[PDB]
């Protein structure tokens, strides 16, 4: 016979790239947008803006 | 039916908590730094 050596995702190395969080109701609330912005830094230049 | 948005995820570590100075009167003596 032949076994099936299963693999776990978290135990891989790639897992460090993305963060995985279990959101259960996504399939329902995905009907619209979520639309969060992030940021941008800005240097304080001299002279009046 | 003219879909809309929803409240966005906010980071678990979001700790604005600056109204503690800005509620009514700010106590600068030690409340800062934590900010």
């Amino acid at each position: 016979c032949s076994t099936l050596s299963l693999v776990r995702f978290l135990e891989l190395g790639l897992s460090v790239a993305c963060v995985c969080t279990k959101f259960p109701e996504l399939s329902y609330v995905a009907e619209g947008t979520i639309q969060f912005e992030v940021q941008q830094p800005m240097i304080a230049r001299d002279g009046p803006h | 039916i003219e879909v809309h948005s929803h409240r966005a995820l906010f980071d678990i570590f979001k700790r604005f908590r600056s109204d503690d100075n800005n509620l009514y009167g700010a106590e600068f003596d030690a409340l800062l730094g934590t900010y």
Partner: peptide, 17 residues
């Protein structure tokens, strides 16, 4: 976590590095 509008105001795996 899904909150309403209420407000306040390890293991040892094998890998190559």
């Amino acid at each position: 976590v899904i909150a309403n509008t209420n407000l306040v105001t390890s293991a040892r795996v094998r890998a190559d590095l």
